Write a protein that holds these residues in place. Structure first.
Motif, PDB file in Angstrom:
ATOM      1  N   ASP A 175       0.818  -1.209   0.000  1.00  0.00           N
ATOM      2  CA  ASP A 175       0.000   0.000   0.000  1.00  0.00           C
ATOM      3  C   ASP A 175       0.854   1.262   0.000  1.00  0.00           C
ATOM      4  O   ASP A 175       0.525   2.233  -0.690  1.00  0.00           O
ATOM      5  N   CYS A 176       1.944   1.277   0.763  1.00  0.00           N
ATOM      6  CA  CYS A 176       2.846   2.420   0.782  1.00  0.00           C
ATOM      7  C   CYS A 176       4.099   2.196  -0.054  1.00  0.00           C
ATOM      8  O   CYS A 176       4.942   3.097  -0.130  1.00  0.00           O
ATOM      9  N   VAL A 177       4.229   1.028  -0.689  1.00  0.00           N
ATOM     10  CA  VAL A 177       5.360   0.686  -1.549  1.00  0.00           C
ATOM     11  C   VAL A 177       6.666   0.980  -0.823  1.00  0.00           C
ATOM     12  O   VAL A 177       7.398   1.908  -1.186  1.00  0.00           O
ATOM     13  N   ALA A 178       6.955   0.206   0.216  1.00  0.00           N
ATOM     14  CA  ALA A 178       8.184   0.353   0.981  1.00  0.00           C
ATOM     15  C   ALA A 178       9.171  -0.737   0.588  1.00  0.00           C
ATOM     16  O   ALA A 178       8.788  -1.890   0.372  1.00  0.00           O
ATOM     17  N   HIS A 179      10.446  -0.363   0.492  1.00  0.00           N
ATOM     18  CA  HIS A 179      11.496  -1.296   0.114  1.00  0.00           C
ATOM     19  C   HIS A 179      12.382  -1.710   1.280  1.00  0.00           C
ATOM     20  O   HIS A 179      13.173  -2.649   1.132  1.00  0.00           O
ATOM     21  N   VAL A 180      12.267  -1.049   2.429  1.00  0.00           N
ATOM     22  CA  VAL A 180      13.146  -1.273   3.569  1.00  0.00           C
ATOM     23  C   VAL A 180      12.299  -1.552   4.803  1.00  0.00           C
ATOM     24  O   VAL A 180      11.273  -0.898   5.023  1.00  0.00           O
ATOM     25  N   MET A 181      12.729  -2.523   5.609  1.00  0.00           N
ATOM     26  CA  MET A 181      12.098  -2.814   6.890  1.00  0.00           C
ATOM     27  C   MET A 181      13.164  -2.903   7.969  1.00  0.00           C
ATOM     28  O   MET A 181      14.148  -3.635   7.820  1.00  0.00           O
ATOM     29  N   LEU A 182      12.964  -2.158   9.052  1.00  0.00           N
ATOM     30  CA  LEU A 182      13.858  -2.178  10.202  1.00  0.00           C
ATOM     31  C   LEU A 182      13.159  -2.942  11.321  1.00  0.00           C
ATOM     32  O   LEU A 182      12.161  -2.469  11.875  1.00  0.00           O
ATOM     33  N   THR A 183      13.672  -4.124  11.642  1.00  0.00           N
ATOM     34  CA  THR A 183      13.052  -4.991  12.637  1.00  0.00           C
ATOM     35  C   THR A 183      14.119  -5.410  13.647  1.00  0.00           C
ATOM     36  O   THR A 183      15.213  -4.836  13.721  1.00  0.00           O
ATOM     37  N   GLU A 184      13.800  -6.418  14.459  1.00  0.00           N
ATOM     38  CA  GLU A 184      14.735  -6.955  15.437  1.00  0.00           C
ATOM     39  C   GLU A 184      14.752  -8.475  15.346  1.00  0.00           C
ATOM     40  O   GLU A 184      13.981  -9.082  14.599  1.00  0.00           O
ATOM     41  N   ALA A 185      15.641  -9.084  16.138  1.00  0.00           N
ATOM     42  CA  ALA A 185      15.936 -10.507  15.989  1.00  0.00           C
ATOM     43  C   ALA A 185      14.708 -11.372  16.239  1.00  0.00           C
ATOM     44  O   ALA A 185      14.500 -12.375  15.548  1.00  0.00           O
ATOM     45  N   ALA A 186      13.886 -11.006  17.224  1.00  0.00           N
ATOM     46  CA  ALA A 186      12.704 -11.807  17.528  1.00  0.00           C
ATOM     47  C   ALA A 186      11.728 -11.819  16.358  1.00  0.00           C
ATOM     48  O   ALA A 186      11.086 -12.840  16.084  1.00  0.00           O
ATOM     49  N   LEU A 187      11.610 -10.697  15.650  1.00  0.00           N
ATOM     50  CA  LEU A 187      10.671 -10.555  14.547  1.00  0.00           C
ATOM     51  C   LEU A 187      11.328 -10.747  13.186  1.00  0.00           C
ATOM     52  O   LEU A 187      10.709 -10.445  12.160  1.00  0.00           O
ATOM     53  N   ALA A 188      12.566 -11.239  13.155  1.00  0.00           N
ATOM     54  CA  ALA A 188      13.233 -11.476  11.878  1.00  0.00           C
ATOM     55  C   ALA A 188      12.541 -12.533  11.023  1.00  0.00           C
ATOM     56  O   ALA A 188      12.412 -12.306   9.807  1.00  0.00           O
TER      57      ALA A 188
END
Lengths: 417, 416
Positions: free
Chosen positions: A102-115
């Protein structure tokens, strides 16, 4: 610093790193991050993102629980003119993949638990290309967060950010069809910080903030406005099982001066504080998101004397705080949500956008600079939301002679549900 | 309505007149002017103004004492997009004529008291085509204020005012040579109001403002920012002989919650209030523009317990408040002007724009959104004041390891 006459929390971060480098900015599980440390890490993340195509206006997803890397990620995205998109970490990979499209995003910043979740989002939606994992290393076609900071770092070229530039896309949890992402400019966020200032107040020398709700939520991201503007420390509390004794222990140790809790949590904290009191520096108590019994409000006032008790209402992903109930009126006008704050215009209208007589029930509609700009790439929903020139909250309210707002809706029973 | 995401005190006036029309906006000599009344009058003066050929960007000068018609004039000029220029009433007609020439203004809003002075300015400068007088009828060469409001135009059609539009031109009292008019946008005033919010705080239910300093001065017009933004009443105190007992009587009756006074005035108030106490609702005490002895701060704290004591520094026609000294630090850091406020960046430099070592003396230079846009039609002085990418205050300061600012100066002798 505050160059080009701009006002946003990236310029605020620079001003604080220059003027008070070693002052506390964030406190997380007992470790202090100064403004010089936060600015150095944010600029390093902004350089690593800029080196991978992230430019002005691009969207950067954030899928983190409460931790410092969340705030680092919002600021780093905004530092290069990018739009941060905080995500409910309890969403399925499919639900997140729909938002990516919907927002056409190419990058995601997450953490190890949610990898593993972000990995699943990419398999569904190949638009997600760059996944950075806080607390993880560079492996499995994924970038380690600390690995990217230690790269070239601070290759950020100074970006002019107009105040009306989009800073956040806050998607609404209302999954009633096509997703709706509220766009919030820096000007929006500044004006919302102003509302916090003339209600909760501020002490430049002693205040210590606290965010114990999820940072992806507007309530959590809002509790960062005061700390980032005024250059005051903010305690980020890890999400977990509610524990009144541990919370009071942390409030005692961090010298927190203001906290928000739901009434059920306040009842748990007051009985714990009345039994084994902690040396607290609390200046203002906030409640909301549930009705407060009169006995509880008086117990709070007795358990915490010399503290002001406030209750905000109206804030969602699309709307700012619109009504405020100061503790002076919590008894005279009990059951109310307060009066409409002075930086917000409001009307109580019917189905034909006509004003109802005073004291009669209708939908409260708002006009204010702190309203969302639009729903991202959704003119139809935005046109409906601002039908007739006023934002439609969807709340049936009733305004009386003194200007106080009573929200009328049928109560909910948890046993039936 | 709050129009198209614009923040300015004209839109706030419209907002207050809709949400709380009968709420008190201004108090002047025992008369309450509600937000609806202030809206009606301001819209009438703006409709009268736009009829005389004044439009967007034009300059409207104001030559008034402390009076409700002062605030009405500022709002009415800004409501049509014009720029208000408050004038020092102690100036001579010759000195005012120099200011009419610099900003090229054709309309001057004055009052019956200063009306002879305004006539003298028009005799020198024929560019003063219109002179409207508050408190006086319509003469042959002068228009009447209350008579122009009878023909209310209702600000014609609504005017879109960008947040970066100039709202005021504040000429410096210095005027060593060519006059300098600092241009202040609405965004400037909005940010300055924010500083008041996180220093003095606000109670949007019981606060009652107070301005006793001259309204034409930046310190005067600044005390209006909070009341107009938050929809809280402001008491306008007339200019005249100082009477601590009379002032305390008015603070008691009007239920004032915050006031600024010079240390010499606080001394008189504290002695009077300790001798014959009034039922005050004071919450915040502000001092400044003179040094406060160690004993006076202790007396203010003892005379007015449960109140916060604040002292601002840095605010001029060109600059906003840059430093704040809170009550806890007033004695721990005696003589200091405080620390630099969080929404202002400041360096201490030498003649080459290079930082001096911490604790050493240099000129304090500022970067902030709440700085003046420029000197009106004076790019030479504007570039000189912003030389090197920072605003030059002219004040020589030092900054200790804790960040507290000490302004160096030389005390002025009263006999000489």
């Amino acid at each position: 610093p505050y160059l080009a006459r701009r006002q946003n929390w990236v310029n605020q971060l620079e001003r604080h790193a220059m003027m008070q480098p070693d002052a506390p900015a964030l406190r997380f599980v007992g470790n202090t991050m100064t403004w010089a440390d936060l600015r150095r890490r944010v600029a390093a993340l902004a350089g690593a993102l800029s080196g991978r195509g992230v430019g002005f206006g691009d969207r950067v997803m954030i899928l983190m629980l409460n931790r410092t890397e969340f705030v680092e990620s919002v600021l780093a995205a905004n530092m290069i003119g990018a739009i941060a998109v905080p995500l409910n970490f309890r969403l399925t990979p499919t639900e997140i993949a729909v938002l990516v499209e919907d927002c056409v995003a190419h990058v995601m910043l997450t953490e190890a638990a949610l990898a593993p979740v972000a990995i699943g989002v990419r398999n569904i939606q190949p638009l997600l290309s760059v996944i950075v994992v806080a607390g993880g290393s560079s492996q499995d076609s994924v970038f380690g967060y600390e690995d990217l900071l230690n790269e070239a770092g601070d290759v950020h070229e100074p970006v002019d950010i107009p105040n009306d530039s989009p800073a956040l896309i806050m998607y609404t949890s209302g999954t009633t069809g096509r997703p709706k992402g509220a766009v919030l400019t820096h000007a929006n966020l500044t004006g919302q910080a102003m509302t916090a200032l003339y209600t909760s107040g501020a002490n430049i020398n002693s205040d210590v903030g606290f965010v114990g709700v999820p940072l992806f939520h507007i309530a959590g991201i809002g509790n960062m406005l005061t700390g980032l503007l005024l250059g005051l420390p903010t305690v980020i509390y890890p999400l977990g099982a509610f524990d009144p004794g541990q919370l009071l222990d942390v409030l005692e140790a961090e010298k927190v001066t203001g906290i928000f809790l739901v009434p059920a949590q306040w009842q748990a904290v007051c009985t714990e504080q009345q039994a084994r009191p902690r040396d607290l520096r609390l200046r203002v108590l906030s409640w909301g998101a549930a009705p407060a019994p009169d006995a509880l409000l008086r117990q709070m006032s007795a358990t915490f004397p010399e503290t002001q008790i406030l209750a905000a209402f109206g804030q969602t992903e699309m709307s700012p705080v619109t009504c405020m109930l100061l503790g002076e009126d919590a008894i005279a006008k009990r059951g109310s949500v307060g009066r409409v704050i002075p930086t917000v215009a409001a009307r109580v209208v019917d189905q034909n956008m006509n004003d109802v007589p005073v004291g009669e029930v209708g939908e409260i509609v708002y006009r204010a600079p702190t309203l969302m700009s639009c729903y991202w790439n959704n003119p139809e929903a935005t046109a409906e939301a601002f039908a007739g020139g006023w934002f439609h909250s969807g709340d049936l309210v009733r305004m009386d002679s003194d200007g106080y707002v009573w929200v009328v809706d049928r109560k909910k029973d948890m046993i039936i549900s």
